[PDB]
Amino acid sequence: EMEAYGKFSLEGCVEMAWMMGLIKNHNGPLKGKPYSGWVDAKTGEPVD
Amino acid sequence: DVLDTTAQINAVINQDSGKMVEVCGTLKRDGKPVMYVTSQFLYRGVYTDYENTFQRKDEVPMQLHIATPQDLAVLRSKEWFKLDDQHDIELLGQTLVFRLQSLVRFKNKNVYSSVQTIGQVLLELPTKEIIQVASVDYEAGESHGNPVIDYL
Amino acid sequence: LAGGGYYNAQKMSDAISKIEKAIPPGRGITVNLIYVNPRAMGWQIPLLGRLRADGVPIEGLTIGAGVPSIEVANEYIQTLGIRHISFKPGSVDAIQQVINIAKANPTFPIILQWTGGRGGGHHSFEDFHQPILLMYSRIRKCSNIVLVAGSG
Amino acid sequence: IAGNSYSWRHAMFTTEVFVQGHRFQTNPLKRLFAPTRGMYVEITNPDDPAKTVISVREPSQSAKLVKTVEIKLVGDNEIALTLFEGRTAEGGVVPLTFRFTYHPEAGYAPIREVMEGRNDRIKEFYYRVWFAEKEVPFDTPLTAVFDGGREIV
Amino acid sequence: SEMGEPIHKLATRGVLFWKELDDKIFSLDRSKRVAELKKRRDYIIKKLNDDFQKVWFGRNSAGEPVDLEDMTYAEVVHRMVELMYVKHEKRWIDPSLKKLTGDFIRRVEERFTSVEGQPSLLQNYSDLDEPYPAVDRILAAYPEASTQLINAQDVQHFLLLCQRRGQKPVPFVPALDENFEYWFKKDSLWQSEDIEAVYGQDVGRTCILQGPVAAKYSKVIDEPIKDIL
Amino acid sequence: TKLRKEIMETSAIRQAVIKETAIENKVVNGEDHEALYRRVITEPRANLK
Numbered sequence: 091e092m093e094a095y096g097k098f099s100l101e102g103c104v105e106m107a108w109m110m111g112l113i114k115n116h117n118g119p120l121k122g123k124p125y126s127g128w129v130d131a132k133t134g135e136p137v138d
Numbered sequence: 139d140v141l142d143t144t145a146q147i148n149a150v151i152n153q154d155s156g157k158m159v160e161v162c163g164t165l166k167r168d169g170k171p172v173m174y175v176t177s178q179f180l181y182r183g184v185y186t187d188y189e190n191t192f193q194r195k196d197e198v199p200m201q202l203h204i205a206t207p208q209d210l211a212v213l214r215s216k217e218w219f220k221l222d223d224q225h226d227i228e229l230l231g232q233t234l235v236f237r238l239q240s241l242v243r244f245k246n247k248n249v250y251s252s253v254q255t256i257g258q259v260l261l262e263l264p265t266k267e268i269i270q271v272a273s274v275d276y277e278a279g280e281s282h283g284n285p286v287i288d289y290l
Numbered sequence: 291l292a293g294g295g296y297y298n299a300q301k302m303s304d305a306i307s308k309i310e311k312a313i314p315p316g317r318g319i320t321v322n323l324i325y326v327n328p329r330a331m332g333w334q335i336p337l338l339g340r341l342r343a344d345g346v347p348i349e350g351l352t353i354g355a356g357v358p359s360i361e362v363a364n365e366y367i368q369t370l371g372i373r374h375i376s377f378k379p380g381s382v383d384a385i386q387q388v389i390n391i392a393k394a395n396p397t398f399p400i401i402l403q404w405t406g407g408r409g410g411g412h413h414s415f416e417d418f419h420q421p422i423l424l425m426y427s428r429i430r431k432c433s434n435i436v437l438v439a440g441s442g
Numbered sequence: 443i444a445g446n447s448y449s450w451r452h453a454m455f456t457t458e459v460f461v462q463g464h465r466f467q468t469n470p471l472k473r474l475f476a477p478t479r480g481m482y483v484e485i486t487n488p489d490d491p492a493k494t495v496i497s498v499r500e501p502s503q504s505a506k507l508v509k510t511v512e513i514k515l516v517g518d519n520e521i522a523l524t525l526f527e528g529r530t531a532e533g534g535v536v537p538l539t540f541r542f543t544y545h546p547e548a549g550y551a552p553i554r555e556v557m558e559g560r561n562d563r564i565k566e567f568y569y570r571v572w573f574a575e576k577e578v579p580f581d582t583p584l585t586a587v588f589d590g591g592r593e594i595v
Numbered sequence: 596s597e598m599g600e601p602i603h604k605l606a607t608r609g610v611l612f613w614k615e616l617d618d619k620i621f622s623l624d625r626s627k628r629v630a631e632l633k634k635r636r637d638y639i640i641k642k643l644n645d646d647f648q649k650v651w652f653g654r655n656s657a658g659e660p661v662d663l664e665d666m667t668y669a670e671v672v673h674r675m676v677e678l679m680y681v682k683h684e685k686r687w688i689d690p691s692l693k694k695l696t697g698d699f700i701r702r703v704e705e706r707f708t709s710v711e712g713q714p715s716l717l718q719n720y721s722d723l724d725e726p727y728p729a730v731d732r733i734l735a736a737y738p739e740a741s742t743q744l745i746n747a748q749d750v751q752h753f754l755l756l757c758q759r760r761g762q763k764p765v766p767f768v769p770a771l772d773e774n775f776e777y778w779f780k781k782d783s784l785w786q787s788e789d790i791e792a793v794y795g796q797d798v799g800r801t802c803i804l805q806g807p808v809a810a811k812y813s814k815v816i817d818e819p820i821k822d823i824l
Numbered sequence: 825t826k827l828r829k830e831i832m833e834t835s836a837i838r839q840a841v842i843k844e845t846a847i848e849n850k851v852v853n854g855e856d857h858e859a860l861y862r863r864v865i866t867e868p869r870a871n872l873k
């Protein structure tokens with residue numbers, strides 16, 4: 091992506107964000123209400 | 139004294155506590171009104187007879203101050219707002235008084251079966267002259283709130 | 291009226307009102323409430339009670355798969371304006387409970403729908419003879435009890 | 443006051459519910475007939491049903507006894523529950539009556555009430571008791587202004 | 596029961612395979628359960644598909660059953676309609692389940708759009724009222740939704756959607772997870788009093804409550820109550 | 825500065841009214857009706873093919 095297009099796609103960003111440890115998957119209750127998907131690794135908060 | 143007793147029904151609405159009648163008395167001596175005895179009665183019970191429920195409230199005097207031409211342009215953009223042809227006293231930079239009467243008919247205790255608001259838009263001159271610069275006329279059915287009083 | 295298929299407090303107070311109006315006037319309604327679902331009867335019981343007070347034809351209450359404690363019962367009895375109450379014991383011991391509920395209200399209708407180990411759905415591990423055979427005496431000796439056989 | 447004979451007179455002091463359309467209703471006789479200091483109850487031609495008259499005489503603050511309520515029958519099935527108010531606009535006893543019909547098919551709800559008119563019937567009563575004119579402007583629109591008329595203090 | 600309480604039922608093929616899992620699956624403590632499910636997976640999945648009130652949600656385009664994780668987006672939205680909307684009666688088993696199927700659709704949209712501005716093709720759930728005609732329209736607007744399988748992420752989402760509060764319990768089993776008991780036996784008896792909704796519409800897989808003794812005491816269908824009574 | 829004004833002014837009025845009227849709708853049709861009838865614009869996710 092970088093070598094060719096010169097910037098990341100959202101798909102790229104999500105992969106980087108994943109491997110760099112900035113976001114991780116969650117599949118349980120977040121603050122009582124259930125939730126599944128991307129979560130900010132640092133804060134338990136969810137990320138879109 | 140000789141007193142002439144005038145009354146009419148200001149609102150009949152069915153609260154949960156029962157059913158409510160608002161009566162507005164008007165004692166007059168010498169043809170001039172001297173005092174208004176207003177009263178409320180409660181037919182306690184359960185009522186779904188919403189067909190004949192209604193109210194004529196005298197809505198509170200509002201003071202709308204017009205500062206921006208964009209303020210003006212929205213006050214004019216309102217359908218219910220009707221400018222008078224008395225004179226073109228630029229409503230800009232002055233404030234207005236909205237003394238409004240309105241009449242409502244209930245259907246659900248929540249939903250307004252039909253609502254109408256009318257009234258006079260006042261302006262005070264540098265001379266304390268009061269003028270009906272405009273007039274209000276809104277009407278609608280199946281309403282949840284009063285879009286005019288709200289704006290104000 | 292099986293309350294066990296009534297989730298929304300509305301859909302129940304709804305179908306209850308349908309029944310009151312398509313019914314032999316003066317006829318009384320009985321609702322069956324599940325005990326091992328206190329979540330549900332959390333609203334159901336105060337719901338019934340509130341309905342009766344408004345005129346609705348509920349004079350019957352039934353509590354299934356569970357016998358309330360003495361004051362648990364007492365409350366239902368003098369809270370909601372039912373004219374009769376009903377329990378569904380399944381244990382030899384269960385029955386003794388009811389008798390005491392009965393002894394607690396020496397002036398109240400208490401139907402004792404006695405089921406056995408062969409009913410539909412829920413079922414004690416009890417042959418429905420021996421318990422009654424061993425209890426009938428005590429049961430009867432309280433006058434408030436209506437001993438209703440059931441099962442098979 | 444109910445008696446042993448299964449009658450109209452029995453079911454009036456037996457059933458705690460008078461049906462009202464599809465509503466239940468607590469037997470008002472339970473209230474009216476609740477024991478009171480110096481109250482009097484007469485049962486006319488007791489054992490002869492259709493010709494029985496139940497009446498109540500209480501002590502008015504100024505009088506020995508007074509006609510409180512009475513329940514005769516009228517038109518076969520219509521029972522007539524009547525209350526009598528001394529102090530009224532015309533200075534003379536006015537009666538208010540509630541009509542009931544009773545179908546012993548249903549031993550559960552032997553007594554019902556005839557309410558179709560009940561509202562007006564009572565309004566009438568009141569009207570007479572307040573203004574002493576026994577005809578009411580039933581069909582006046584509420585938009586209409588109502589007249590109280592001249593009056594000297 | 597799911598509560599564990601004992602029940603008397605018409606020993607239909609379903610209520611039989613239900614007693615089955617009572618003894619082999621629901622008998623084991625929570626933990627050891629999931630493991631034992633994976634071992635008898637394709638068995639439980641057959642018996643699920645064949646004779647139970649709720650079928651295995653795992654169908655693919657061709658008709659065979661597969662893992663939820665192996666279905667395409669299309670295939671899922673489709674199977675959703677299939678199993679909640681009764682074709683020959685033009686009705687959803689429950690508005691809530693139409694919503695559900697609607698929401699997941701909305702999702703597939705999202706998964707397959709990558710620029711802000713584009714609005715939803717399913718703008719009102721009213722659209723799903725006559726679904727199969729309309730659905731194909733949306734799904735065709737997002738081509739690849741028929742090429743690639745659910746995101747692992749999306750599977751997890753789907754699964755939480757089938758669990759939401761205030762929705763009628765899904766009329767199937769999405770997978771054999773830690774909740775398989777809930778999937779199986781929640782809100783089961785409504786299908787007795789509406790075999791038209793049931794897959795194949797045979798009582799064979801249905802839950803009907805009956806005493807053991809009062810079963811001979813019934814010999815004619817459809818007797819009016821006032822008669823019996 | 826004269827033109828500057830007009831452009832800023834007429835635009836401001838225009839988008840002002842928009843809010844006003846779409847807010848009057850929440851008053852009349854209630855939160856519920858209004859809410860359920862807004863262009864649902866899907867939020868872009870990412871899929872790793």
Ligand SMILES: NC(=O)c1ccc[n+]([C@@H]2O[C@H](COP(=O)([O-])OP(=O)(O)OC[C@H]3O[C@@H](n4cnc5c(N)ncnc54)[C@H](OP(=O)(O)O)[C@@H]3O)[C@@H](O)[C@H]2O)c1
Pocket residue numbers: 294295297324326327354355410411412598689691761762763764780781782783784
């Ligand atoms: N003693 C007996 O012989 C006997 C026999 C049968 C049943 N029962 C009792 O009766 C009760 C009912 O049992 P069950 O098996 O029918 O219930 P269940 O399997 O425990 O679950 C039924 C649930 O499905 C949900 N549901 C269904 N349709 C819905 C809709 N349209 N919208 C929202 N939610 C919907 C409700 O959710 P919610 O959780 O939100 O309410 C409801 O509680 C239980 O307490 C049971 O023990 C007793």
Ligand SMILES: Cc1cc2nc3c(=O)[nH]c(=O)nc-3n(C[C@H](O)[C@H](O)[C@H](O)COP(=O)(O)O)c2cc1C
Pocket residue numbers: 292293294322323324353354355378405408409410411412440441442803804805806807808809
């Ligand atoms: C389909 C079905 C639903 C039932 N629901 C209840 C209930 O909600 N509450 C209760 O106390 N008993 C319930 N029962 C059991 C009955 O109340 C009664 O005790 C029993 O069915 C009578 O025995 P029988 O099946 O042999 O006629 C249910 C029985 C069946 C078959």
